[PDB]
């Protein structure tokens, strides 16, 4: 709508009131990256057409949304101005992210930690750290939705990697800022037919990007690499661990047993108190309300509630030489 040449909106720094649009797309990062030679090329504004550009925005920024022919009319408005020169493809993904189509399938249907994890995947093509989560989740409590999307696009990380004329994509760099920044980017970005839509919570990277420890499982990293790097690892060797992983990433199993929260229990034969292991540590959960004559004082036997293993210190800390 704005003006037929604009490079940046909203005036967050003073140097965009004088800034020109880049005439040519920005180069790749100059480190080596042996995995990027096995990758498809960059889709940019100069080389591609509008059938390639609208497909590759839908394949990265929208995930795989399966956008129908009538639905998302707001993205058809922001695509009508991209072809007219009114906004760049940096500003086109800013209009996509602040649209109602991006909201109704990533904000109001997913979780709150899970919304921040998809925005690094859609706009930056990687996964955050826990210090990067807690600064983007304060904006969702104090400034809402639109100031959070505006912090990705106006970041220094965006304009160095993509600039004004390159669609976002998974950048393979060579040297990364940590070694865990590599293998969380690969885990968050698999290839075809993935579509983070009914995966109603991530729950594997939602607890791996909550610790600066817990480097995650290597079969979620050998899977989404380019092939000719993972042949002679996927005949039938690590292949069955991938079969189990994809049956437990879909249907979204929670990692309270195996990955976070790790209590080696006692043997089965060493107690034999309440017979079987199925019903061993069950004790009832009782909640009353006591408001007038509508209570439903319902005792339920809750499950095996386990030790916090974090709230038990405190113990051997609050009473170390004391008590």
């Amino acid at each position: 709508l704005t003006l037929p040449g604009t490079a940046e909106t909203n005036l967050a720094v003073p140097s965009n009131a004088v800034r020109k649009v880049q005439p040519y797309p920005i180069a790749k990062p100059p480190s080596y990256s042996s995995v990027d030679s096995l990758r498809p090329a960059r889709v940019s504004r100069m080389d591609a057409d509008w059938a390639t550009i609208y497909e590759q925005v839908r394949r990265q920024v929208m995930g795989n949304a399966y956008v129908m022919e009538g639905e998302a009319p707001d993205i058809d408005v922001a695509f009508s101005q991209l072809k007219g020169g009114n906004l760049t493809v940096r500003e086109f993904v800013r209009a996509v992210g602040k649209s109602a189509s991006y909201r109704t399938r990533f904000m109001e249907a997913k979780s709150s930690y899970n919304f921040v994890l998809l925005n690094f995947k859609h706009f930056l093509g990687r996964a955050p750290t826990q210090e990067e989560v807690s600064t983007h989740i304060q904006i969702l409590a104090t400034s809402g939705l639109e100031a959070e999307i505006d912090s990705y696009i106006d970041s220094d990380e965006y304009k160095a990697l993509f600039g004004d004329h390159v669609v976002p994509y998974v950048v393979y760099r060579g040297t990364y800022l940590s070694s865990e920044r590599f293998n969380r980017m690969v885990k968050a970005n698999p290839g075809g037919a993935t579509s983070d839509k009914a995966k109603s919570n991530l729950n594997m990277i939602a607890t791996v990007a909550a610790d600066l420890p817990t480097d995650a499982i290597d079969v979620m990293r050998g899977l989404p690499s380019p092939i000719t790097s993972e042949t002679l690892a996927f005949g039938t060797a690590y292949y069955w661990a991938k079969v189990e992983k994809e049956a437990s990433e879909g249907r979204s199993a929670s990692p309270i047993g195996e990955k976070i929260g790790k209590f080696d229990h006692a043997p089965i034969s060493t107690y034999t108190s309440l017979c079987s292991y199925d019903k061993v540590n069950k004790a009832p959960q009782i909640s009353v309300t006591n408001v007038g004559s509508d209570e439903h004082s319902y005792v339920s036997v809750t499950s095996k509630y386990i030790a916090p293993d974090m709230a038990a210190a405190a113990q051997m800390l609050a009473d170390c030489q004391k008590y």
């Binding site: 022919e69 009538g70 904000m107 969702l140 639109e146």
Partner: protein, 164 residues
């Protein structure tokens, strides 16, 4: 879904704030229509078989070319399928009078219609014949009250506008 209570808790949460006083003005507007459209909802629900008894063979009364072979209506079972195709719409017209918005009509009847009816060779001009016949057949004092028949007929050219 695309309702009045969903579009105020999403406008509260896109700015990250509490329920204010400006969304409590909106739910007072729900009190002023749910004696009109809620008893418009029961009038369609009791007369649901007798309006497609009107509008079902009134669709073929306009266009009778597609009761031929090589076409979209081949035999009696496709015409029995076609009456199921229109009875799903008056189900969804009933559903968005209980909800209030255009919630159930979009993602259950409207989204993907340009995909499905083009590839399966179904003409959209006969779909807008059945609902526009149902629009002008609404008489105000015979059927219901007066304002119950306003947002009844405001949903009937909603989905005509999504198929024109």
């Amino acid at each position: 879904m695309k309702s009045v209570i969903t579009t105020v808790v999403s406008a509260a949460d896109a700015a990250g704030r509490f329920p204010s006083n400006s969304d409590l003005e909106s739910i007072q507007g729900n009190i002023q229509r749910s004696a009109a459209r809620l008893e418009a909802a029961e009038k369609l629900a009791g007369n649901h078989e007798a309006v497609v008894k009107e509008a079902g063979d009134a669709c073929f009364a306009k266009y009778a070319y597609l009761k031929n072979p090589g076409e979209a209506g081949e035999n009696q079972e496709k015409i029995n399928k076609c009456y199921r195709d229109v009875d799903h719409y008056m189900r969804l017209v009933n559903y968005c009078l209980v909800v209030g918005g255009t919630g159930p009509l979009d993602e259950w009847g409207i989204a993907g219609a340009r995909e499905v009816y083009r590839t399966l060779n179904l003409p959209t001009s006969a779909y807008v014949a059945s609902i526009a016949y149902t629009r002008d057949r609404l008489c105000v004092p015979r059927d219901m009250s007066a304002q119950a028949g306003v947002e009844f007929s405001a949903y009937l050219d909603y989905l005509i506008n999504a198929l024109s």
